[PDB]
Structure formats: structure tokens, C-alpha cells
Amino acid sequence: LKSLSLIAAHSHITGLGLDENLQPRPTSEGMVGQLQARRAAGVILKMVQNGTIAGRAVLVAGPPSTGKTALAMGVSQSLGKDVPFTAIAGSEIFSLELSKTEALTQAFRKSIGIKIKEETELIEGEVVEIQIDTGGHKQGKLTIKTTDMETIYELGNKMIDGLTKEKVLAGDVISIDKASGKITKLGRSFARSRDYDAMGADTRFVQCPEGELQKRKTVVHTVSLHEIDVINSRTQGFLALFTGDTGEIRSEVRDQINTKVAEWKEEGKAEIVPGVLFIDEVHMLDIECFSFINRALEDEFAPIVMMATNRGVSKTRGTNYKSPHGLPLDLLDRSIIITTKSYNEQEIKTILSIRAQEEEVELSSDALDLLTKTGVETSLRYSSNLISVAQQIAMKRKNNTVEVEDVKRAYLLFLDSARSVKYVQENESQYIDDQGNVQISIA
Amino acid sequence: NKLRETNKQLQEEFGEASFLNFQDANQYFKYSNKQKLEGTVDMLNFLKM
Amino acid sequence: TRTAAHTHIKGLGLDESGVAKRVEGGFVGQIEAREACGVIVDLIKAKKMSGRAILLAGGPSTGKTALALAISQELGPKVPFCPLVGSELYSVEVKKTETLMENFRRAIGLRIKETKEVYEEVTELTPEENPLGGYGKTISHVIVGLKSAKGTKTLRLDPTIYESIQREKVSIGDVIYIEANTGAVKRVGRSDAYATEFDLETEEYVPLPKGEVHKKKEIVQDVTLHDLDVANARPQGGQDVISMMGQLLKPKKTEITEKLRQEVNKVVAKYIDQGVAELIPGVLFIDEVNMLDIEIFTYLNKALESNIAPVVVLASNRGMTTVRGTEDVISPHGVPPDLIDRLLIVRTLPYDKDEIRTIIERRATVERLQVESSALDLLATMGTETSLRYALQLLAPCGILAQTSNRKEIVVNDVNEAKLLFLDAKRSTKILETSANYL
Amino acid sequence: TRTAAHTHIKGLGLDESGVAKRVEGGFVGQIEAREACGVIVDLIKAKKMSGRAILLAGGPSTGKTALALAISQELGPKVPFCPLVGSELYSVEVKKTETLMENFRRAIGLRIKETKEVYEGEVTELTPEDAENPLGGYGKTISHVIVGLKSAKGTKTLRLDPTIYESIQREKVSIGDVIYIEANTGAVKRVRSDAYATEFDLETEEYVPLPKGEVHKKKEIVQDVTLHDLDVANARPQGGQDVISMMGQLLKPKKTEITEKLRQEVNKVVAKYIDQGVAELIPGVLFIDEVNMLDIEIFTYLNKALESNIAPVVVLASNRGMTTVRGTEDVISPHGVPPDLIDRLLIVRTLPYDKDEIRTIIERRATVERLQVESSALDLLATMGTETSLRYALQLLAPCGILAQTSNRKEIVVNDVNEAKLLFLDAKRSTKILETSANYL
Ligand SMILES: Nc1ncnc2c1ncn2[C@@H]1O[C@H](COP(=O)(O)OP(=O)(O)O)[C@@H](O)[C@H]1O
Ligand SMILES: Nc1ncnc2c1ncn2[C@@H]1O[C@H](COP(=O)(O)OP(=O)(O)O)[C@@H](O)[C@H]1O
Numbered sequence A: 001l002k003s004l005s006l007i008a009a010h011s012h013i014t015g016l017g018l019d020e021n022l023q024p025r026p027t028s029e030g031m032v033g034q035l036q037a038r039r040a041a042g043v044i045l046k047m048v049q050n051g052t053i054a055g056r057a058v059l060v061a062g063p064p065s066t067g068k069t070a071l072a073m074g075v076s077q078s079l080g081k082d083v084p085f086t087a088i089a090g091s092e093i094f095s096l097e098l099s100k101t102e103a104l105t106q107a108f109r110k111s112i113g114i115k116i117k118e119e120t121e122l123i124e125g126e127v128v129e130i131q132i133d134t135g136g137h138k139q140g141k142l143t144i145k146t147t148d149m150e151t152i153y154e155l156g157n158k159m160i161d162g163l164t165k166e167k168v169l170a171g172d173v174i175s176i177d178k179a180s181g182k183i184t185k186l187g188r189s190f191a192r193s194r195d196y197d198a199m200g201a202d203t204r205f206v207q208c209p210e211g212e213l214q215k216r217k218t219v220v221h222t223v224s225l226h227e228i229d230v231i232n233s234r235t236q237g238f239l240a241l242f243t244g245d246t247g248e249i250r251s252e253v254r255d256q257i258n259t260k261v262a263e264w265k266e267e268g269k270a271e272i273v274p275g276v277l278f279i280d281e282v283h284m285l286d287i288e289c290f291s292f293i294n295r296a297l298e299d300e301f302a303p304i305v306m307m308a309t310n311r312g313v314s315k316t317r318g319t320n321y322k323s324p325h326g327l328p329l330d331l332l333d334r335s336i337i338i339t340t341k342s343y344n345e346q347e348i349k350t351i352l353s354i355r356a357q358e359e360e361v362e363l364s365s366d367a368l369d370l371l372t373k374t375g376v377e378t379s380l381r382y383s384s385n386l387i388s389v390a391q392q393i394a395m396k397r398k399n400n401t402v403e404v405e406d407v408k409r410a411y412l413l414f415l416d417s418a419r420s421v422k423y424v425q426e427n428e429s430q431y432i433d434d435q436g437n438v439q440i441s442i443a
Numbered sequence B: 001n002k003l004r005e006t007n008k009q010l011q012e013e014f015g016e017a018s019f020l021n022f023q024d025a026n027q028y029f030k031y032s033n034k035q036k037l038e039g040t041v042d043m044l045n046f047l048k049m
Numbered sequence C: 001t002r003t004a005a006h007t008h009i010k011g012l013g014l015d016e017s018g019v020a021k022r023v024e025g026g027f028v029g030q031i032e033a034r035e036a037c038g039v040i041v042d043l044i045k046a047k048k049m050s051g052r053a054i055l056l057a058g059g060p061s062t063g064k065t066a067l068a069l070a071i072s073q074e075l076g077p078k079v080p081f082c083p084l085v086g087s088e089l090y091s092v093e094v095k096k097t098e099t100l101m102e103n104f105r106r107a108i109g110l111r112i113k114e115t116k117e118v119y120e121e122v123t124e125l126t127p128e129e130n131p132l133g134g135y136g137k138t139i140s141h142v143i144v145g146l147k148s149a150k151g152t153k154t155l156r157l158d159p160t161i162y163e164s165i166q167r168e169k170v171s172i173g174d175v176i177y178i179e180a181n182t183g184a185v186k187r188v189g190r191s192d193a194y195a196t197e198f199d200l201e202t203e204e205y206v207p208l209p210k211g212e213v214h215k216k217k218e219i220v221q222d223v224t225l226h227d228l229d230v231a232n233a234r235p236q237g238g239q240d241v242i243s244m245m246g247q248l249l250k251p252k253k254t255e256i257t258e259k260l261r262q263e264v265n266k267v268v269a270k271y272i273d274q275g276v277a278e279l280i281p282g283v284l285f286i287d288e289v290n291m292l293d294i295e296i297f298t299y300l301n302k303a304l305e306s307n308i309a310p311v312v313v314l315a316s317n318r319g320m321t322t323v324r325g326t327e328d329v330i331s332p333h334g335v336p337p338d339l340i341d342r343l344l345i346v347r348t349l350p351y352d353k354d355e356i357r358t359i360i361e362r363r364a365t366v367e368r369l370q371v372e373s374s375a376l377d378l379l380a381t382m383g384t385e386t387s388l389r390y391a392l393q394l395l396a397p398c399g400i401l402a403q404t405s406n407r408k409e410i411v412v413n414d415v416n417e418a419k420l421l422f423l424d425a426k427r428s429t430k431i432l433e434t435s436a437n438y439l
Numbered sequence D: 001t002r003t004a005a006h007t008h009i010k011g012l013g014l015d016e017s018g019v020a021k022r023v024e025g026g027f028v029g030q031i032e033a034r035e036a037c038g039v040i041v042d043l044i045k046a047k048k049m050s051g052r053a054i055l056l057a058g059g060p061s062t063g064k065t066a067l068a069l070a071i072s073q074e075l076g077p078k079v080p081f082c083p084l085v086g087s088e089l090y091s092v093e094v095k096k097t098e099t100l101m102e103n104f105r106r107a108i109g110l111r112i113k114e115t116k117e118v119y120e121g122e123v124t125e126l127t128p129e130d131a132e133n134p135l136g137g138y139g140k141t142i143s144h145v146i147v148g149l150k151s152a153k154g155t156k157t158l159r160l161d162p163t164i165y166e167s168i169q170r171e172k173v174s175i176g177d178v179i180y181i182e183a184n185t186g187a188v189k190r191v192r193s194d195a196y197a198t199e200f201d202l203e204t205e206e207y208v209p210l211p212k213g214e215v216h217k218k219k220e221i222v223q224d225v226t227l228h229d230l231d232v233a234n235a236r237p238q239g240g241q242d243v244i245s246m247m248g249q250l251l252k253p254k255k256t257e258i259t260e261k262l263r264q265e266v267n268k269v270v271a272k273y274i275d276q277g278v279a280e281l282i283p284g285v286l287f288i289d290e291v292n293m294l295d296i297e298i299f300t301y302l303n304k305a306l307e308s309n310i311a312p313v314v315v316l317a318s319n320r321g322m323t324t325v326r327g328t329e330d331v332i333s334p335h336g337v338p339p340d341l342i343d344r345l346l347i348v349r350t351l352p353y354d355k356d357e358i359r360t361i362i363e364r365r366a367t368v369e370r371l372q373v374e375s376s377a378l379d380l381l382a383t384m385g386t387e388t389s390l391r392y393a394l395q396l397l398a399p400c401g402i403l404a405q406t407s408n409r410k411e412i413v414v415n416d417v418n419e420a421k422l423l424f425l426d427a428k429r430s431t432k433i434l435e436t437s438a439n440y441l
């Protein structure tokens, strides 16, 4: 209902096609193939909603375009609401106004959620009439009214002073805290609704409340730990969640608020919920961040952390050795690896068909087969991008269907990555080299 | 709905002010009703926005 | 009446049914690229599907920037268009990825509609008392009157508006317009009715407004979400503490959080669901993308799978180079292969002698200059021999030399002298390598 | 009800006279390391001399962090413990040395204990007792002020010095409803009685009850803070509308280079207070995990700082061998620590476990999280725990429990762990796949 989306790169993924005993369906909710990875993801999910053990590291491997982010999107859709899911890439950790360790700590505190229950008692929209008086400390007893309920209440000097600030005719209905708080204007009644030829932005006509004004209602409140720390970081820091100037909060609010949340949990009025923190593009990161993650995995309030990468054995950012998987061996020791194999021709056909129907594109069978053949030759993302341009060129030819020749025209229009590489190889002199050498004189 | 009823009241009052010098010539109270009706209905449209 | 290597490109010159002729829109040659880019314009104009990227490759002086400008012209002045270069991403105030995110949000715009009823000299004003309480003194009501042109009308209001107009410091006999939405009123000025009240004055004469006592006008506004979230985050106000502090705070932009993005997305979603707002996806242009870095490229992938990602177009001229930040990664156009897998490639080709000659003709025509046939024919000779841009720039000094000897047209010896006066790259480096006096 | 690789360690499990048994405190194996850690615990408990440091070396997953956590548990909830990692020392706001020094001081705490004497209750009548003026005068000269007292389990009546006339000038509670006075210092404190809650249908102040217990109370107050909090509060401003306070309210108070003169002043005041017999300083323990991430500048500043008077006892952890310490390249050193720093502290050696130790560890891990594992499945778990790693086996328990839950069986079976091992790959198999393929994986 609140989908402002035009599309998404993977919007067909809505949960995981599992069942009672967690068996991956062959095709369900924009997801095809890689059954073992889906079963592992379902196991991790059930672990997450178990919510009884923390500090687990799970790593997702695979070649490019294998759909490792597809699993993350699927599990995020599966868990849905009431559980935080922070999708963070590896590049935003580099801030020049905040230590990388501090940013990682903020992310970790973000992924943990806490809900609390609180109950307020208040009389709403019942202040009817003010009977001022002998003199001094006047209006010591005035009635209250709703559309269905009335009562007379006596007022003291303190309540007289409270009413003195922003005095009202009391012919309207005003809500005042019976819980020894303050007053809150609700608006104006219908009697004076036709009293102004011009309007403002201070008071608006308000309905007379229905039922008894007195009400002691309880409210649940959900918030993550990072916000609850930043709110006590300074005298007032509600802008920090908006402006973004956290300011590297010192490690005194953290432990004291951990003790506070433990006390709240023991009182039973607050319930914690361990969310999932997902990190895409992990292979670029500093070794200091890796060690900090190594330690932070041991914390009691450690959310489930899932990593995604595609590089194999390569240099790590911060060292001079080509470590396998792009990560230090220590981190690999304390993690769980879920490899993903390549994709198949039938899987390619199903994925391309799902993409085509996602953007409500009518596709001829032969054009779909040609797209599958190309996606076997080149990457599948190539055809998953060419589908839209083929639809556009078919529209330009005034035929609703995507004929084969339209797809061929789209293919001939845009170069393949390999085709572009080959053409550059043929025309090295024309382009500019890495040594600053280039030729522009044809003759 | 009441103010739309006042629109209808204006219509029955005088033809959206068409019959002012021929029908409403000798009655001024209905004139003062007609000034209120459309103004208040436009104000209540503003109130609904 | 001035140009800088452009502004003679009027659109893409693509006819109906997607066809490009030879000479149109100040554009010649490279038909297939224009066809493809027109298809891209159609896709953007569909406004259905967003989040794509397209990179075009070619040699120097090929018309890539011209292609992008043709795209922007074809789209029109309604859809936002944010040109950019790789270097501007770097900053000393916030992260590179963050600045990329402000640009990303700046690319997409939104058109909003709203109607306003306003009331517009002033006949009189008078407040109406016993507060029936501990308050000192107040007025039960305030009655005022507005003159305007299309008849006058009295007005009854609350002493809050009386206070506001008192703070506006407006004379009793004056012209006033009052906002019905919130009650904000500003001093329009001394109305024309009370002209020459004294011999000498300073207040503006402010001719009396011609219209009804109350006027309703329709306002259509086109803004981007980037203005929206910075407006949300930045505080406002008058004398309140944070207001003065921000007034003296040197408001440097700092790391807009994603919570504002979620909130504004929710609000605009419910507004477009109501049907008052319409979202217009834009196109963001990054010229000379080889200057970016690995971090920017990876976060570019991540932002490219985002929900409200606008269509972006990339430009480069590098070949089998090594992408900055690393040294072991040799990739075409200095773009990492994972990013290359995520967009399309449009090829562009060098021109010929005939095409260069036609470019010279067009460029001479737009600047209101006369070129002799033989002079233009020889201009094409070192246009091909050295470069197109050298001959393109040579034209204005030749025109100046023609102005020297009082002749509107341009002759062969004039351009020969111009070539002798100003050297090209090849001749300059020849002199540099020949000499040994630090030159 | 949740754990993360730890919290099953209940202290060090060291008996009297320093002896460690096999199974205790969730700890098995590495007897001598536990003995040395208990020795260090006793040395810290001596609270006599400070500045000593110790580093412990070993292979990965050898329980170093477990040993540190056990030490922290043994010390108790009074002496402060400051966990830290080498990377956390870096910052973009202050110097690294400033962060190190402030953490050093954050390690050491201070306990202050004191007692106050208070008379409280309900006052039947608040009226001073007039008397003749000793000097030739007139009017009314108060000699004493009688104060009524009324509390649950104890009630009296007493009189006070008429100097409280200014104290009684502003209380705004009631006619002697609930009061709070001091003997030596006097003063008053607004505290209405619950007996008048229902007399008014509305009330914006929650009625307070009468004091319970003796009408006079001698209650003690104990506070435990660190000197870092002390001099942070000393440096940080306070107050309300004054210029400095309002400026700091919008200044985003980033920490910046607390000067040494404040350190000297707080040292002087705490010294004079402990000499006064009212304060007791408690040296703490500070933990730098994964010290190989540090740099030469931090190492040299550490060498300088550990010679200071109030340097707390620190514990260092590393798992490097013949490595090159960061910052430089020519310095080859064990554990990536410069030799001069090594010369200033002792080394504790840890040793790898065996098959039986790994099996016992897996048994403890199964028991703590309320799981049931068959003996054959447990033995198999031990088999690839030895074959690949202990941490992989420890992590694999939860997925096996999930698979068992899928088919509705509380226990765990061999084929369950076979399926779990098939689903989740270890490091060696993963790098085998990585080296076999050529599609960028
Ligand atoms: N198994 C799959 N089921 C459905 N869609 C898939 C699958 N694998 C890949 N895709 C599609 O491929 C696109 C890109 O996949 P992505 O996760 O970015 O690849 P990588 O694993 O290289 O990150 C996604 O939009 C997704 O829709
Ligand atoms: N077909 C064309 N018609 C008109 N002008 C052109 C054409 N091709 C290139 N130009 C000129 O070339 C310039 C753009 O060069 P461009 O190809 O963008 O350089 P680069 O290849 O370095 O991006 C523009 O000023 C434009 O006037």
C-alpha cells in the first residue's frame, strides 16, 4: 500500500519459497535455483526469530551476478516488520568526522531493537465552562463535559495557575493530564466555528469527545539501541538522528544504558528484539575494522551479522598479502560460509521470464529463447537490462509484442562488455593509454 | 453536507443571484442569508482541506 | 549571443519512428549513437522504470558531452538534469559516498500543486474586554476592514492576527494582504490612495491592488527531494536559541541520515497516493568518470540497486587502464568489471574529413562569420592533420585578423598567419624536445 | 538467556592455595595459565603497587579472551574493568596518546563512603518559641523552634536553633506534613502526607508517605566513580542561562585534550580526601585486546606512561609470531611488539587443546544452551572439531538444533550434523572451491 517504488532491481523477491519443514520450492516469489543456499538462509532465519543466541557470523560467497544479494533481500522481506534490518555497504564506514570503529559501533547498536510499554491516564476534551469569582484563587470548581458524559471538578490554586497560562473560554473541549502533568489545547467547538472571516494556524475546530473523558491507556514503544543512546548523548540530541552529527559518543552512556535496559528487562516492562545487520561489499575494509568485528561478535547484544562478497584470493585493504576470500583467516575461522553455485539455462529462462512479466512486457517465445542464448553467452544482467530497451524499440515500431528483430536491434545498438573490450583492443591507438599517450592526428 | 444544503438554499433563494432586482428586490433578509451561504460553504471547503 | 563549443546543438534531431538524418539540430554524423540515445530519452520519458545506468565510450573530441547536452535538451526543462564531473565528488566537509547521495537525490524532482485563498487599502481596525480570569487584559474580538479595488469588505478576527499585524508595523491607512492559511501578514507598503500625504516621504507608493477582497490562486511548484530533506534537517525560526546559533553556525552540510530519507519517502508516497503530488524521475550525468575511486564505485553499485535510483549516464575516454585506488586491476575505461556488468555500453566513432568540414561550416555559421570556400577547405586539412578542436578554436583569431584589415570574410593567408602565430600540440612538443634550455 | 561464545565461564575455578581442577567454572584445560591468572588476580587484589603489565601469547581460538573474562569475573563488580581493542585507540577528534591516557585513568576507580544524620517525620505545629531578647530591645526574639515529629515505628518531638527561620521561609508543602532536616547542617527539603489525597478531587503533586522507621536516621551513602569522570566533570562546564553554559549547549562538546593540570588538581584532592579517611582508591584493570594493531607512537607513549605513579595494571593479548610491528618495516619482533616494550612486562604461554579437550568443550557448549546431543553425534562433532577447528564445531550446534526442530526431535542425530556440515562450509573447503574455479570465485 505504501509502495512508492517505480521498480527495484530485484522487486519480485518477496520472502523465501519455503514451507513448514523448510523445503525450498523450485520457484516462488522471484527466486529460482540455489536450493542449498535458500535452505541455509531459512535455517538462519528461523535462528533469528528464535532470538535466544546472539553473536553469530554468517558469510555469503559466490561469483558476480550469482544472486547473493537476492538471498539478503529475500530474508529481509521474510522477516518483515517488527525486526530491524540494517543494509549497510562497506564504503560508508569511511567517515572523516567519525572513527571507523565508532561507525561500526553505531551500526551494531542500530541493529538491536527494544520495545517498552507505558500507560498514561488523562481526561480528554472536558473543561466545560469557567466560573470565575469572592476574588482571588477564583474558578475553583468548573464542570467537565463530553458528547456523552459530564462531571463537576474542583480546582486548586496550582490548577488555577495552570489554567491562567493560555486561558480559554472553556466552551470548547480541552484535554488535560489527570496524571499530574499539564494541559494541552485540543481546539474549538462548533458554536464558534462561524465566528471568523479569516483563519490562522493556532486553533482548529475540534469535535466534542465521545465517551468518558477519563482514560488510562497503555502505549507500546519500539526503538533501536543506537537512537536510545544518542538521545542521552547530550542534553538534547533528537537532531543527531536527523542531522547526523553523533559526535563520537564516549563510552559512558553505552554501559550505563546497557545496565538500564537490563533493569527494564528484569522489570518485564521492556522486551528486546535482536535484528539482523547485513553488510554488502565486505571485501573492501580495513584490518582494524576486521579485528573490531572479531571482538564485537562476543558482545551479549550482538545482532546476527551477514556478509556478502565475490572476490577470491586477493590482497586485503590494509596489508601486503593476498589472503584467500579477501578476508583475514581469523575472521574466516569464526564465521559460517554459504557458497552459491552458478546459474543454469532453465533457471536463466525462468529468471528472464519473471523479469519480463515484472515490467508487464509481452514477450514472444523466440525472442525469449534468443535472450536466454545471449544470457548464456554473456551475463544474465545483460539480457535483464536489454529487455526494457527491446520493449522500447518494439514500441517505436508500433508492435506491442517484443519481436525477435527488435531484440536483435537492441543487441546491435549496445555493446557487450567483452565486445567493448575487443573493440578497444582493435583501436588501442585511438583511446588514451595509462601512460597518458593518445593519438588524435588521423594522418 | 449542511453547507451544500446552503448552496441549494442559495439556488432556491435567487438563481445564484440572478433574480436579485426582480424577485429579491423587496426582501433584504434573504439577501443577508445569500451573502452567508456561499461564503460559509467555501470556508468549510477550506476547512475540509 | 555567446557560445562555448556548444549551444549550437538543438536536441538530438531524431524524427518520428526513431530515425536520424544527416544535418539537423546542429548535429552531423554518428547516427547510431543518436538513435540509441533517443531510445534512452524515450525510456526516461516513460517514467515507469528507474535505476538503470549507461556508459558511452570513445576517443577525445568525439562529442560525448555534446551527446549528453542533446539528451538534456530533448528531455526539456521540466525533468531535472544534474551535470557533474568525477572530481567534484571529493570534498573536505563530508564523505564521498554521502555527496554522491545528495547528487543522487538531487537528480529526481517532484511537481506539487496547491491552491491558496488570500485576502487583500485598510478601511479601519478595532479590537473588542474582561478576560473572566487571572489574565491582565485582552480583546474579545478584532474587527478590521480592507479596501482593495473590487469593492471593500470588513473582517472579524482574533487578537493574535492583531498582534501579528502590529508587529508588522503597518499604518491604519495602508494596503495589507493577509494569508488565510496561517495568518502571516507583511507590510505591503504605503498605498497609492494616500499619495503626497506630506511634501517629502520615503515609503513606496504601492499602487492599490486590482482584484477582489479575497483572491484564490493556483500554485504549481517543482522541487527535488534533495531540497526536501535538507529543509527538514536544517532548523528555522527567529529569536529562539537554536535559531540564532544556526544563524551564526556556518551551516556546513553534514551527513544526512537515512531516517529523513525514509520519512520524506513515506510523506511523498502518501501525497502522490492522495493525488496532489507527481514524481518526475531525473537523469544524473557524471562526466569523465575515470577520476572516481573504488569506494565510490562499490557504493555506486549499492546505490544503483536502490529503490528511487534515477537513470544515470556516464562518460569516459580511457582504455586498458588501471582504475584509481588500486594497481592490480586493469579494466576498460578505468571502470571496475563488476560495475561494467551493471550497465550498457554505447560506442562512438571518430569522424572523417567530410564530417569535420561540415562541423567547421556549422560552427562558422552560428558565430555569424564568413569563410571563403578555399579557406574552409584548407581548415579541414589541418583539422584532419592535427585535430578538430584546434581548427574549431582557430576561427575566432582568424576573424579578428580579418577585422584588422577591414574585411568581413576570411582568406587563406589570414588563416595561414593564424596557424603560424598559435602552435598546436605536435609542434609545441617538437619545440620542447628540440630545445634544452628547460623548454 | 542468550550467550555469545562466552558467559559460560564462571570465574577462574581456582581452589584455595592456588590449584585448578579439571571441570569447574565452565573451564577445562590449560591449568598453568589459570594458575598464573589467579596469581595476577591476587596481586591486583593486594591493591599495593601499580604499573605492572603482562602479555599472553598463543594460537587463535586458544581461550585468551576467555582467560581475560574469567579474570574480570574473579575480580568482582567493585574493581573496574575496561575492555578495549587496539583499533579503538584511533580517533579523528584527539590524539591517540590522549585516548590512551584517558582510558588508563578510566581503568582506576575510587569509592567514597560517608554517613549523614537526618531527623524527619510529620510536624504537628510549625511555630517558633518566642523568648525575651537578651539585648535591650522589643518585639519577638526566638530562642528555640519546636518541631513536631511523626513517623511509622518511631515518633518524638524536638526543638532547634531559631536560625532555621530562613530555612522555613520557603518550603511550600503543607502545615508540617512531611519534613527533612539535618542535625549538624540544618536546612530543609520539600517532601504532602498521604492522609489528604482524597480531600481534593484533583491534585498535580503525588502525595508522599510518612517516614518509615526511627524518627532519626543515620544512613550511609557509598559512591564508586573513576577519576576520568572526575576530571571530565571538572573540565566540563555546568549551569544554566550563563554565557558559557548556553554556548556549550550548542557547541557539540567533542572531547579535546584534557590538560595535565586538572590531573594534578584531582590527584591532590583525592589524596587529601584519602588522607582525611573519607575516600578509598581502588586500582583497576585495563584490557587491550589484539595489541598487534597498535603503532610505534602508541608503544613509546605506553613505555612512558607505565612508569607513572597511577598507571593501572594492564593485560595485553596477541596471536602473532615473527611479525613486523606496524609503522616500521625493519623491526622484526615476536607478536609484533617492539623488544623494549617486551622487556617491561611478563609473558604467559597458552597451549592448544586436544581431541578430548575439544570434546569436553563441545559437551559444555551443548549443556549451557539447553540442548541434547547423542553420544555418537557428539563424538563426530569432536572429530571434525579436531579436523578443522574448534570454533566451527561450536558454531555448528545451533543449525543442528534447528534441523532437529524441523523434524520434531529434541535430540541431535549423526545425519543431522552431516547435513549441517554439507550445508555450511569450513575455511579449507571454501578456499578449495575458490582455487578450483576461475569465474572470479
Ligand atoms: N536465484 C535467483 N532468483 C531470482 N533472481 C535472481 C537470482 N539470482 C540472481 N537474481 C537476480 O539477479 C539480480 C542481481 O543479482 P545480485 O545479487 O546483484 O548478484 P551478486 O550475487 O553478484 O550480487 C537481482 O536483481 C536478482 O533479481
Ligand atoms: N556531430 C557533431 N555535431 C556538432 N558538433 C560536434 C559533433 N561531434 C562533436 N562535436 C563538437 O565536439 C565537442 C564535444 O567533444 P566531445 O566528443 O564531447 O569530447 P570528448 O570525446 O573528449 O568527450 C562539442 O563542442 C561539439 O561542438
Ligand SMILES: Nc1ncnc2c1ncn2[C@@H]1O[C@H](COP(=O)(O)OP(=O)(O)O)[C@@H](O)[C@H]1O
Binding pocket: D004, D005, D006, D026, D027, D028, D029, D030, D058, D059, D060, D061, D062, D063, D064, D065, D066, D067, D319, D361
Ligand atoms: N578452557 C576453556 N573452557 C571453555 N571455553 C573455552 C576454553 N578454551 C577456549 N574456549 C572457547 O574459545 C573461545 C575463545 O577463544 P580464544 O582462545 O580467546 O581466541 P584467541 O586465541 O583468538 O584469543 C571462547 O568462546 C571459549 O568459549
Ligand SMILES: [Mg+2]
Binding pocket: A061, A062, A283, A308, A309, A310, A311, A312, A325, A326
Ligand atoms: Mg568475494
Ligand SMILES: [Mg+2]
Binding pocket: C061, C062, C063, C064, C065, C066
Ligand atoms: Mg567531450
Ligand SMILES: [Mg+2]
Binding pocket: D061, D062, D063, D064, D065, D066
Ligand atoms: Mg580469543
